[PDB]
Amino acid sequence: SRRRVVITGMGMLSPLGLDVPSSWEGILAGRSGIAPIEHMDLSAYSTRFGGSVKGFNVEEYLSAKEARKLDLFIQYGLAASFQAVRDSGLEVTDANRERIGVSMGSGIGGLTNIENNCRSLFEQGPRRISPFFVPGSIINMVSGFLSIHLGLQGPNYALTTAQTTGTHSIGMAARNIAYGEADVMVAGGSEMAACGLGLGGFGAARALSTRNDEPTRASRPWDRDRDGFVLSDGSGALVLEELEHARARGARIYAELVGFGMSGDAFHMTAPPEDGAGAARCMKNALRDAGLDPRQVDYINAHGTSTPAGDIAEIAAVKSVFGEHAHALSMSSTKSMTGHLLGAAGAVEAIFSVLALRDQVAPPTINLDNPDEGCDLDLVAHEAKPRKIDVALSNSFGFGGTNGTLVFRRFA
Amino acid sequence: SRRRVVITGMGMLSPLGLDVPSSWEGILAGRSGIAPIEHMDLSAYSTRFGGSVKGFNVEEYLSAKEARKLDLFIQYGLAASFQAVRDSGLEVTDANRERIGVSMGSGIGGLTNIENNCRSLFEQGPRRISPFFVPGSIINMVSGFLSIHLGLQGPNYALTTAQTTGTHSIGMAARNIAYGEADVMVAGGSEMAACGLGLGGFGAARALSTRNDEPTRASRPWDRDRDGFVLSDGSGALVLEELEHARARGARIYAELVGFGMSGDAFHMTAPPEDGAGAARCMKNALRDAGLDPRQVDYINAHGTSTPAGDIAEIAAVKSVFGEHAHALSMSSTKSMTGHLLGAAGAVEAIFSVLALRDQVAPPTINLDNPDEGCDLDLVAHEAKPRKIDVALSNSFGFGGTNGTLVFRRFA
Numbered sequence: 001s002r003r004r005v006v007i008t009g010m011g012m013l014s015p016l017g018l019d020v021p022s023s024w025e026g027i028l029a030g031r032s033g034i035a036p037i038e039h040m041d042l043s044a045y046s047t048r049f050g051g052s053v054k055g056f057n058v059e060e061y062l063s064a065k066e067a068r069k070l071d072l073f074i075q076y077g078l079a080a081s082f083q084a085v086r087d088s089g090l091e092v093t094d095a096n097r098e099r100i101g102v103s104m105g106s107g108i109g110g111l112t113n114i115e116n117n118c119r120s121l122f123e124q125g126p127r128r129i130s131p132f133f134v135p136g137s138i139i140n141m142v143s144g145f146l147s148i149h150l151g152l153q154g155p156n157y158a159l160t161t162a163q164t165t166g167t168h169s170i171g172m173a174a175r176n177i178a179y180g181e182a183d184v185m186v187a188g189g190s191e192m193a194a195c196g197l198g199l200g201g202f203g204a205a206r207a208l209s210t211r212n213d214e215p216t217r218a219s220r221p222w223d224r225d226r227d228g229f230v231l232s233d234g235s236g237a238l239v240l241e242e243l244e245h246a247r248a249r250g251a252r253i254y255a256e257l258v259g260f261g262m263s264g265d266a267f268h269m270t271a272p273p274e275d276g277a278g279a280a281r282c283m284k285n286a287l288r289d290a291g292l293d294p295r296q297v298d299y300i301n302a303h304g305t306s307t308p309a310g311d312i313a314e315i316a317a318v319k320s321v322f323g324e325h326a327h328a329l330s331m332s333s334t335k336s337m338t339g340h341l342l343g344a345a346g347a348v349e350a351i352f353s354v355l356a357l358r359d360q361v362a363p364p365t366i367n368l369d370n371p372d373e374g375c376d377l378d379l380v381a382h383e384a385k386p387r388k389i390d391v392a393l394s395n396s397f398g399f400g401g402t403n404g405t406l407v408f409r410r411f412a
Numbered sequence: 413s414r415r416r417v418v419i420t421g422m423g424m425l426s427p428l429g430l431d432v433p434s435s436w437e438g439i440l441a442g443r444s445g446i447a448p449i450e451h452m453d454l455s456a457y458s459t460r461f462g463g464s465v466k467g468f469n470v471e472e473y474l475s476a477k478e479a480r481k482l483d484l485f486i487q488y489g490l491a492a493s494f495q496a497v498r499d500s501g502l503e504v505t506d507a508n509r510e511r512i513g514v515s516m517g518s519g520i521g522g523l524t525n526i527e528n529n530c531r532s533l534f535e536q537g538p539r540r541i542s543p544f545f546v547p548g549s550i551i552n553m554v555s556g557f558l559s560i561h562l563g564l565q566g567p568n569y570a571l572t573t574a575q576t577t578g579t580h581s582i583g584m585a586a587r588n589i590a591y592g593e594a595d596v597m598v599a600g601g602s603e604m605a606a607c608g609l610g611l612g613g614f615g616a617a618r619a620l621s622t623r624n625d626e627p628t629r630a631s632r633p634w635d636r637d638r639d640g641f642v643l644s645d646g647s648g649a650l651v652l653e654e655l656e657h658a659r660a661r662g663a664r665i666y667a668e669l670v671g672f673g674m675s676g677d678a679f680h681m682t683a684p685p686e687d688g689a690g691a692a693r694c695m696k697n698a699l700r701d702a703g704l705d706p707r708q709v710d711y712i713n714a715h716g717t718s719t720p721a722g723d724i725a726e727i728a729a730v731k732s733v734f735g736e737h738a739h740a741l742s743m744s745s746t747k748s749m750t751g752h753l754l755g756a757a758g759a760v761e762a763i764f765s766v767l768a769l770r771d772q773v774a775p776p777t778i779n780l781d782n783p784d785e786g787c788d789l790d791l792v793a794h795e796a797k798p799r800k801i802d803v804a805l806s807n808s809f810g811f812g813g814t815n816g817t818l819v820f821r822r823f824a
């Protein structure tokens with residue numbers, strides 16, 4: 001058999017706020033974190049808006065000197081991680097530090113740092129490149145720096161599965177604990193790809209909403225007028241903990257992580273299949289892993305990116321998995337408010353899933369003014385819906401047809 | 413309940429060969445694959461050589477139409493993945509495609525591609541960024557593209573743990589199979605960091621050998637005259653397979669993967685501890701994971717990067733784990749010949765470890781002219797050593813203090 005895993009701490013930076021409760025408050029009020037991107041010339045760019053972290057103060061976490069060495073994505077991952085560990089009340093000791101690990105990932109990593117060091121290289125040649133360029137930019141440095149700052153000697157790694165990173169990070173952290181390689185893991189993701197290369201790179205694939213006139217309306221998952229996703233920055237981190245370890249120290253337990261599913265579509269590099277066959281296999285994998293019948297699922301935090309093919313695949317996938325229960329469950333995209341945090345999306349959305357369980361409320365899908373063809377499910381258009389939620393799914397479906405599903409259950 | 417895991421297929425691009433057998437012939441003959449770099453102008457750089465993949469034809473594997481969209485690290489990962497799957501004899505079918513996944517990782521990923529697109533952005537503006545910039549550069553796309561081309565619908569993911577990537581990728585793919593999430597995994601990693609930011613960034617950190625006038629003598633693990641690692645390019649992939657599934661199809665089994673350890677130093681962003689304490693914990697985790705008396709270990713394929721601190725920390729780690737038996741086992745660094753393939757280091761070296769078992773030979777550490785203070789173990793100086801090898805261990809350490817160990821033994 002296998003050990004049970006609970007959530008005892010959460011941390012977040014999002015376009016809605018600099019912590020979980022500020023973020024969760026924006027989510028339940030249907031507020032948008034989307035705005036024109038500042039202190040950056042986007043003249044030559046078809047998309048000029050996104051979900052920025054507003055007012056981030058890294059010196060609450062790090063000295064100026066240590067922050068100068070670290071890409072914004074690492075800073076964001078450290079901020080959420082430190083919030084999550086503080087939130088958990090866990091005490092690291094010589095007795096337990098070998099049993100505490102980290103799996104904080106990113107989809108794209110240090111584009112901003114790569115951009116500024118490129119500028120240096122092209123203008124002045126190699127000797128102006130920072131000595132901290134490599135360790136200040138590579139995706140495993142959130143796990144590296146967190147482990148060094150807190151003395152964590154457990155499993156130390158980083159996932160990078162594009163828009164699935166946060167979901168896979170949390171799921172595989174849960175496995176480490178369940179199968180006895182760790183008693184505690186800090187897991188989630190962080191992203192800051194709102195530089196030229198991010199807006200440029202996604203802009204050149206014409207993957208992005210170009211609704212520059214109304215940035216807050218850009219992200220409209222399942223609405224007939226959606227025109228691609230909104231690029232957003234931030235981080236989410238969860239403290240995952242074995243149940244007996246959490247009980248022994250009197251931890252506050254938000255919820256239980258009961259299920260993790262993975263699948264590959266094996267279909268296309270960036271587009272999901274129209275029937276969502278891959279997202280369906282993955283959800284079924286996640287429910288089987290949790291020993292749950294589809295009928296027991298109450299709430300789904302959808303991937304719901306506001307891409308035309310993505311949104312419609314997820315409706316197909318849900319009807320396929322859930323049959324006669326597909327309308328009774330509530331499903332919303334919090335990306336309607338946050339935008340797409342890419343590798344961080346699954347981290348912040350796992351937190352919103354855990355808070356849907358705590359507060360017995362489905363977050364809205366805002367901007368769902370005119371449901372598309374077949375988009376007839378309970379998508380919680382416009383405003384939050386209080387309701388019974390015992391079981392909550394969080395889905396992530398990313399580039400390369402990589403799929404993740406987390407199952408959370410109320411704990412008592 | 414935990415199932416056993418065997419190697420049925422291996423694939424490789426290295427500075428010594430465009431497959432495994434050609435690479436292996438170089439290893440046993442003590443050949444260096446390090447040379448001045450030709451693919452760019454390095455006169456302004458303090459290091460001007462590396463382990464380049466020579467004569468790679470991507471059209472053994474892909475259309476030039478698909479290949480053009482992909483960074484070399486992805487092309488290298490696919491080439492190794494395809495070799496390994498072919499070498500396995502496995503046929504993908506409707507009956508098994510859900511039970512075959514992929515975990516191919518990278519340390520840095522598509523730095524070449526991100527650089528070239530950055531140069532386009534800076535000189536010409538955002539509209540010259542390739543529409544293929546994101547799917548062609550991000551680390552999960554070896555796993556993505558391989559799943560699309562072979563129809564693998566199993567667990568689909570990528571690790572990025574700097575120089576530990578290949579070892580972690582292989583270990584956690586083995587856990588997927590061990591605990592029933594999959595019957596087959598294609599696991600390893602790929603790296604092509606030999607661009608301006610790579611050589612520039614590692615140069616700025618003073619991490620690289622500057623032995624430009626004798627590049628084949630640069631990589632000299634445990635030698636008193638070593639001055640940093642040699643940057644090398646390539647890929648390794650193994651087909652990992654549940655033992656009964658391998659037996660059932662009459663698969664040729666190269667060796668059994670019995671053991672996997674992880675640990676974090678929690679010491680420094682880039683420097684290993686002088687005493688090898690984190691490496692020691694990681695190897696001890698792996699030996700206990702395999703149910704082994706440490707005296708059963710015959711061969712260690714060291715990380716052995718040719719850094720002053722790295723190499724000495726490893727001797728200390730091995731003496732501490734193995735006590736007097738440290739004097740009886742054979743340890744070598746094939747990085748003496750291949751240089752440091754970073755994220756792909758653990759993948760190729762896991763293959764060298766398996767081939768060490770098949771042929772009953774310890775590969776040499778070339779250039780070990782004057783062993784340093786305390787480097788007094790059997791380091792297989794100069795020349796391959798035929799010897800009894802039942803159990804082989806492959807170590808990796810990386811930035812963030814992240815450690816991986818793999819334990820293989822002969823299968824009967």
Ligand SMILES: COc1ccc2sc(N)nc2c1
Pocket residue numbers: 172175176179181584587588591592593
């Ligand atoms: C069922 O899949 C599993 C089980 C155990 C483990 S330990 C790890 N690192 N990943 C996994 C995945």
